[PDB]
Specification:
Blueprint (H helix, E strand, L loop, with lengths): L4 E7 L7 H16 L7 E4 L40 H9 L20 E7 L1 E2 L2 E2 L7 E2 H14 L4 E7 L17 E5 L9 E2 L16 E2 H10 L9 H11 L7 E4 L9 H4 L12
Bound molecules: a molecule of 2 linked components (NAG-FUC) and 2-acetamido-2-deoxy-beta-D-glucopyranose (NAG) (2 copies).
Family: Belongs to the peptidase C13 family.
Keywords: Disulfide bond, Glycoprotein, Hydrolase, Protease, Signal, Thiol protease
Organism: Viola philippica
């Protein structure tokens, strides 16, 4: 069978100054929606304190680029507030609705021919953030991926991580023979760069916070610019790695042959870009 495309999108932070992590994740949702991925198969973890924040100059709107579209519109709210935590994130990956404690109960209850795309935005050596402690440590995330692999409930999985030291979540830990490929904004010893901040030329005067993260907006704007049936994960890896080489080293881990897949295997493609063949 062709299977179904599923995704987990998670912004691991809270607070209006962290606008960018929720904007990054809402942008990824818009790409999946335009690609034909269904809401029932997209699990969203976002604190939800940005859109109607008294500090937002545009209530109900979240943008991930100056003059960009409203990426908040229609985004599902599976886990918001303090329901974003290691217990719910790991149970959602595993697909066990009986292990969720608070939230909508939407989980990756996948079948062997399904594809999974996971995107996290919001890091330190060996761990990534949750809105409140405890943070998510490398071993606990990788052990959850090993449990998922042992169930055999997926064809292949692609995991994208936007965080400082992102590569430390997988380096020397992520198995290479279980059809899981991971791409990280930075390697184990590097920080990550924020972008679309106030001060840069032609920036809107209403904002006092950064609208995105450099690696995230580089791969997200690439997804928006091409027919994703003509671009592989490997082609995106090479393009984004070269594009932000001055800021961080884009790194890959796990089952590298999985990146031979076209991005559309995970994300679909927007018909508006059908003529935009990748070169
Ligand atoms: C799915 O999860 C069920 C419930 O797990 C129990 O409750 C959660 C909240 C944790 O406290 C966990 O440690 C408990 O065991 C399990 O009973 C069930 O076996 C799981 N199903 C599968 C197929 O793994
Ligand atoms: C708005 O953002 C501030 C950050 O200063 C946060 O403390 C507050 O809880 C947020 N409020 C709402 C209603 O989202
Ligand atoms: C991580 O990137 C730095 C450059 O920022 C490089 O010097 C270092 O060798 C890299 N580490 C690994 C394990 O590749």
């Amino acid at each position: 069978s062709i299977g179904t495309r599923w995704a987990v999108l998670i912004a691991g932070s809270k607070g209006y100054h962290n606008y960018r992590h929720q904007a990054d994740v809402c942008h990824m949702y818009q790409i999946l929606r335009k690609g034909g991925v269904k809401d029932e198969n997209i699990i969203v973890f976002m604190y939800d304190d940005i859109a109607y924040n008294e500090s937002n100059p545009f209530p109900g709107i979240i943008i991930n680029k100056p003059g960009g579209e409203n990426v908040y519109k229609g985004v599902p709210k599976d886990y918001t507030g303090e329901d974003i935590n290691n217990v719910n994130f790991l149970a959602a990956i595993l697909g066990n609705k009986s292990a969720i404690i608070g939230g909508s109960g939407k989980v990756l209850d996948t079948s062997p021919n399904d594809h999974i795309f996971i995107y996290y935005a919001x890091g330190a050596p060996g761990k990534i953030g949750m809105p409140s402690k405890p943070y998510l440590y490398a071993d606990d995330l990788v052990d959850t991926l090993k449990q998922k692999a042992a169930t055999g409930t997926y064809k292949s999985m692609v995991f994208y991580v936007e965080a400082a030291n992102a590569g430390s979540m997988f380096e020397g830990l992520l198995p290479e023979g279980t059809n899981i490929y991971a791409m990280a904004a930075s390697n184990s010893t590097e920080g990550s760069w924020i972008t679309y901040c106030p001060g840069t030329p032609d920036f809107p005067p209403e904002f006092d916070v950064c609208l995105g993260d450099l690696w995230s907006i580089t791969f997200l704007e690439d997804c928006d610019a091409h027919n994703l049936r003509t671009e592989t994960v490997h082609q995106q890896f090479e393009l984004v790695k070269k594009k932000i080489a001055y800021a961080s080293t884009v790194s890959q881990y796990g089952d590298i042959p999985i990146s031979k897949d076209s991005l559309s295997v995970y994300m679909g493609t927007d018909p508006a870009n059908d003529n935009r063949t990748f070169v």
